[model samples]
Target: MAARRALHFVFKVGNRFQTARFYRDVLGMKVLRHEEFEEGCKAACNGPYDGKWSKTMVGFGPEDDHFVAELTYNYGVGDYKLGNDFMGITLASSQAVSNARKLEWPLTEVAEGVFETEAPGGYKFYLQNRSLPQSDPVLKVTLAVSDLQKSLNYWCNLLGMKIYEKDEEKQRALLGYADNQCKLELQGVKGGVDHAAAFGRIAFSCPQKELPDLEDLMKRENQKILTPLVSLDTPGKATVQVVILADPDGHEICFVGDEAFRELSKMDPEGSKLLDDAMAADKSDEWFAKHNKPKASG
Candidate 1:
């Protein structure tokens, strides 16, 4: 069974060190990895690492689990060119919706258990992982809206998402992207354009050969580029790519390739190396290998 262990928030920042402290000091997240550059920095030297400005990436997450928030600080990193397309929230619910307001970090409530906030680098976020029982958890995101079709098209056509279900009376629609866990939902409202500033989406696995289909789809529908497709650093998996887009009402979303490939970063190098010392007493070998596999070879 695939587990939804980690969620991410992307913050494009000017200084690497200052932004790293926002979540650490404000949100109270423990430092998972700080000041540690990934492998192949020489290969990725195109960025500001040459001395124009230092580019650093930091991660902070809960103490108990692997859920993490990645904050990147580039030397020339300006305010992001964020569009209606970007899945900005890295953490789900920080102890339910209402309880999140009690959090010392800057946040606002959308409805019952959903909260909205901004990252250090002007990135947005929607916190929805609540303490409540999630029966159909990995299905849809609830956002109130005005126009159903306009909102639906933003996801269905522009972002290449498909409709899973709709209710006329409820005036709601459930949308699914490339992966099953990625669920987007649209609800109805009376007079006002429902505008949501923060959200996160999903990504599906597509090879370079398969990108033509995505390009063609975008061309046919006239969709705009929110966050363009980019590669991620992972062991063994080389073809990883990701993109972020939005629905009509401007709810941000992301489509990431091979969720497992992206998720493996949650395992700290030390923890993965010292498996026996890391595992709890009740864990089985089957559970360990299934959860943590040997890296793939090129």
Candidate 2:
């Protein structure tokens, strides 16, 4: 099996304005790129909503190397309930911690040299007081599961991830596709995982030829398939095939073709200016208030 690379995680955000500031100022990440939507949804991945939406890709470096975040927003959707499925993304960066302090962002010293903070929309982050890594500062994104062994089998055996470390007593395991890339950490909870309305999706990229086989493997194993093999388009840009699956904990996993994704995810030089412009032009607040209706909540 060809190896896969850890990509970005999709986070549904309502405060697009504030979320971008946290990622840019606190996390020291830049907007790699962004996409806008129109009516009549033709894409396979964009959600069940209609009307306008915005998707932004933010990261410390290029998508080719760095594990980034996909921030998805809807003009009419304002709030989402937090779930227990996601724990927090761990990073090794005193720079981020310092930035949080400078911005007066509240942080709690959870463990020695480790501070915890919540991003806009209730996403959690753990910032270590260590110097930044030469490669990527992101250490891992943790998710909670009911059974550690079962989750390990689904991720390691079925998805072919290598376990870098395991703490049986803590009921947690650290795994990744590559040694230096961002890792995925699974922590076992006493109860079943709850996705609520804000369950996020983690994405990975593999050789283009492996997509079909990946889908077939999921089908054979009776694993949950969120979306069968399908092509996602960005018009005027490239199209990439994606296969979305779910683990034993019902965590969404997206496998996209690496070749086309490399081209599609190229860092746009004007992404920052473009994103800020789009944000400034968003008049959803005024319109919703004028109409005397609260924005839709999910």
Candidate 3:
């Protein structure tokens, strides 16, 4: 459990290097690809900061199937103030629970056979005890909102997310594109939605032909369009198109063109190495600081 002393270290210490290990060794996730950007995304994929940044997609399987996580790492600057806008990501994986336990990553039994754990920067994850081999273990992403009914209209009515379940007591609803994909659980808080500064976007894929119509719908409804329809390019890979939007609670969402995204998202054979290479230099110094000595300490 004490291993968390290192695993939960601040982002600035070794950057997302700690998280690379947390997600890789402890959680059994593979780094899909690391897209290093030179500057701010014209569409704010790096979330408005113009400084250098990179986004690494990690998952158990292909982005086409498994619900992956896009870990955004900013360059050189250090600080983040989070809010309730992001609840947590919950998934079923007896494997992850066991792995973390064996690695001494501290865990809490939020419920019997269910565990609560943190990644770097206090980002929480829920591991429910279940066994469904060869299937997408990631279940859902939870986001908070105010005015449940109003937010519901934006997600369900405007974007057409199918509402699958609701709980009045918990003030949460689970919705999804289809049962085959990962679901979104929106929890309404009486305290009001606070995105704070460090919020990440939830993304979905759709036909390229339909992106403009989505922008049209937003314009017609007078909703917020955070970014107009545009193409986001990575080196030598496919240039993917997307439209960024904001819900009533100010949660950001991205609808990307599915066709080119698949090609751009294909797992890089050296994906894991890219993360480690960026991490190696800073990580070495962090260990030296912790020990207060270098090499043999002679």
Task: TM-score each candidate.
Answer: 0.47, 0.95, 0.85
Top candidate by lDDT: 2
Model 1 off-target regions past 4 Å? 1-9, 24-70, 78-103, 106-117, 122-151, 157-174, 178-182, 185-209, 220-298
TM-score of candidate 1 versus the correct structure, residues matched by position = 0.47
Which runs in model 2 stand beyond 4 Å of their true positions? 39-49
- Number of the top TM-score candidate: 2
Query: What tens-digit string does per-residue lDDT give for candidate 3 at 1-298?
Result: 1100000011221247777888887778888887767764667453233456677888887776677878777653444566778888887888898889899998999988889988876677899877745687788888888877887889889888888998877788998877667788888876888766567688888878889999999999999999999988887789999898999988888888877887887878888887777666334345545757542210
Clashing pairs in 2: none
Q: Given candidate 3, what's the lDDT at residue 53?
A: 63
Ranking by lDDT: 2, 3, 1
Root-mean-square deviation of Cα positions for candidate 2 versus the true structure, in angstroms: 2.9
The worst-scoring run of ten residues by lDDT in candidate 1 lies at 48-57
